[PDB]
Amino acid sequence: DAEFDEGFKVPGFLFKKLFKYQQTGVRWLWELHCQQAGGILGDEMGLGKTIQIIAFLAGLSYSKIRRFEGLGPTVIVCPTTVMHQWVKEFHTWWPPFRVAILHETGSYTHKKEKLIRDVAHCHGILITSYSYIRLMQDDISRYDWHYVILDEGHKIRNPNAAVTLACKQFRTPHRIILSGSPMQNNLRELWSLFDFIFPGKLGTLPVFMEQFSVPITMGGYSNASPVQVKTAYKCACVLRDTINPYLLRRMKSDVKMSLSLPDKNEQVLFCRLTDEQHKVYQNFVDSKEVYRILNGEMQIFSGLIALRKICNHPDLFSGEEDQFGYWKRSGKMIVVESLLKIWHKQGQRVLLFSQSRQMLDILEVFLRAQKYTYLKMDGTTTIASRQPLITRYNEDTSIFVFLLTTRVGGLGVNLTGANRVVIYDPDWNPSTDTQARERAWRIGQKKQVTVYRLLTAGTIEEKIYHRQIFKQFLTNRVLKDPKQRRFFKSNDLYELFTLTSPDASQSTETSAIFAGTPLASSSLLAKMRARNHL
Amino acid sequence: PVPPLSVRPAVVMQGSARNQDDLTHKLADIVKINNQLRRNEQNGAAAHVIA
Amino acid sequence: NTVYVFAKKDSKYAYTGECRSCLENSSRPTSTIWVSMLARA
DNA sequence: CTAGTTGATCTCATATCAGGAGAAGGAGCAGAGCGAATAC
RNA sequence: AUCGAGAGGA
DNA sequence: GTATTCGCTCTGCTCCTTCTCCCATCCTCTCGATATGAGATCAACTAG
């Protein structure tokens, strides 16, 4: 059996099964357990983070380290769609853990409070949903939990949500987060996650923002004064080394040689607005509503929703060959016509993504107007019948296009039989579109998958994509390397109520922006003066 | 104590714009600052900021 | 710009003179100076 | 019993001078009155 | 309709 | 052993300061200013 420095006898017949990065992760988790601190397994999806957690907890139970003779009661807060998976994983790796699910489905068939009491009384392994943490936040937190594992802990990304407060009401030193991305939009989410795992390490959120978030974003613009970008680099370095020993994040660059990965290509099509759609958009951006938005007298949010609706299709905003949702009145639907026809002639299989469920229904009606066989899964479908549809799409070839919104289903529902994917409209979060493209291109994908993002040039959608890239750049700067070539302008990125459609004489805004493509008190002093000159 | 709607009627106007009463606006102010203060006292907030 | 001396019966001054001085070209509002007399070494 | 459909409801997320009068408190001084404290 | 303002009447 | 003071306290007395309140009734007219959907939960079905 493998043995660590202080003595943590992870069993040989489990430890041998792990991969090198998995064993490194178990080492890191147990270093945290010795320091009595929490962490974030920020390894991206597909590497396997549940295996690391069960291996580490099993070693902690067999090693009988101690308070508690070995491992005590632990709570795992995960989305419903994976709860049963978790128990099966335990039951196949380490059987003697009395694992139990808290759910209406469940297995207890009695009062749930009795389940919490009984499981804690046996030092069991208890799995919940985030909603049960929120609802029983006073009840579930009375039985001296030894570990808290927030699987997909990006549910805590908001420092305001009641789930965040209910999850931060736990008392143990041991807080582990299993999230594919600690931050998705901005540094609010990084702060919230670190306030969970380690209450004191990063400062109070005001302090954190005023020190890190504002300088970094101010240095994320290409029109920033040199002092601003240098301060942003320095502050990013400080945040990086502050979070270094508590965020274990591994990419698919170092671990790529261990597992295969088919090549992925991606294009961003810029779909010109149709003349009627262009007229409607120009009338809205000239109407008094956007003027009141610019005055601040009305919520800008409704104007955003309206312009997104216009760029999707005029029939959304406005409300034979003239029925609801005719595909000839929006240029993005023209390109979807061309791509769907060509891909059907190629015999491939398509994922059709869109943030709007109404335009998802419009796309359904369009597909019915054509003769493409298809299958739909969205939020309106019952969850108990979600797994069949996916399976029926993945097993046969007699279904051509599968319809999604970016945010339906559990994280990473296995849509492997698809070959091509089209994202009909961009979202504000880079992570939801990254998840959309990732869902088709996962482990065990047989053929080269390509993603086509559909944009309308010079419109709100182009600015949504620009914001998405900007947030992605911020996340990358924080998480992998601070030095980064600056792409954007502060005023152009934030002003998003104009219409400059290209005439093909001049290039599009995105291509114009992307036009180029003990210490001995002297090392200590050298590092201090180095950081200070920046 | 929030009073009922009859103490602070929302009178309708020549069109559809429903004008609220001064008490309703003031309760809006109290509610917003109460919620905001609540999230500060719940979280870590400077003693002078809480004050 | 005129000195006016009044006497308030109920006050801590027997006599108080004031001038609301104001530069002729209206560069500024009138600024008032008071020269008082403390009430009744 | 027992799963599938239908509505309501909640959360969450998407950007960019020409008053006056009276009552309540606090302030500073003034003294009265009694305990101790030298002292003849 | 509400609010305020102003001008008036006895 | 009693003078005699004497320090210290206990009101208490004016006074100045603050502050809060009030300022006829009723009536007429004019005039200006003043979001949307996806997902989850639950509960009623709505039938098998």
mmCIF file of C-alpha atoms (C1' of nucleotides) in Angstrom, chain A residues 302 305 309 357-358 378-379 408, chain F residues 35-42:
data_model
loop_
_atom_site.group_PDB
_atom_site.id
_atom_site.type_symbol
_atom_site.label_atom_id
_atom_site.label_comp_id
_atom_site.label_asym_id
_atom_site.label_seq_id
_atom_site.Cartn_x
_atom_site.Cartn_y
_atom_site.Cartn_z
ATOM 1 C CA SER A 302 -35.870 44.731 -21.627
ATOM 2 C CA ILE A 305 -34.059 41.000 -24.562
ATOM 3 C CA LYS A 309 -35.274 38.577 -30.043
ATOM 4 C CA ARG A 357 -36.926 28.148 -25.997
ATOM 5 C CA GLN A 358 -39.379 30.197 -28.060
ATOM 6 C CA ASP A 378 -35.837 21.085 -23.465
ATOM 7 C CA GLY A 379 -36.972 22.167 -20.007
ATOM 8 C CA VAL A 408 -31.124 21.877 -20.323
ATOM 9 C "C1'" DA F 35 -38.572 41.717 -19.804
ATOM 10 C "C1'" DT F 36 -38.365 36.607 -20.984
ATOM 11 C "C1'" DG F 37 -37.581 32.014 -20.829
ATOM 12 C "C1'" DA F 38 -35.399 27.501 -18.802
ATOM 13 C "C1'" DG F 39 -35.318 24.454 -14.980
ATOM 14 C "C1'" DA F 40 -37.136 22.674 -10.586
ATOM 15 C "C1'" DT F 41 -41.009 21.570 -7.320
ATOM 16 C "C1'" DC F 42 -45.235 20.406 -6.290
#
